[PDB]
Amino acid sequence: GSHMQVLSYKEAVLRAIDGINQRSSDANLYRLLDLDPRTMDGDPDTPKPVSFTVKETVCPRTTQQSPEDCDFKKDGLVKRCMGTVTLNQARGSFDISCDKDNK
């Protein structure tokens, strides 16, 4: 269907994290911890820089609980994620690498 489904930048990031959890083989669900602030140009099909951290929650990676319902684990791993999102979800996708050693 859609050829143009545009998310806000924050939504695009939450959606990418959903993706990142989906492709991962970690036991637990990771959740947005801190999104770095950045200013955009206003075209939805061009990649927007993102960088942010995620932290391990007490939820199983495949939980269907909403991430906001998944408490961060005490002592939880934090990974820093860098790359781009594309606001137009319709096509293309984010390009983000998460790394526990990028601190």
**Domain CATH code at residue 16:** 3.10.450.10
Instruction: Give the domain extent around 58.
Output: 1-103
Q: Which residues, at least 6 apart from 61, have a Cβ–Cβ distance to it below 8 Å?
A: 21, 24, 25, 26, 27, 28, 29
Deposited experimental method: X-ray
Rg value, the chain, Cα: 14
Beta bridge partners of 78: 55
Sheet containing 95-99: order of strands: 28-35, 48-60, 78-85, 95-99
Residue matched to tokens 């408490």: 71
Question: Contact, 59 vs 74, CB < 8 A?
Answer: no
Separation of alpha carbons 46 and 50, rounded Å: 13
Q: What is the DSSP letter of 61?
A: T
Q: Is 82 helix (H, G, I), strand (E, B) or coil?
A: strand
* Sign of the dihedral defined by the CA atoms of residues 75, 17, 61, 27, in that order: negative
| Domain total of the chain | 1
Separation of alpha carbons 78 and 80, rounded Å: 7
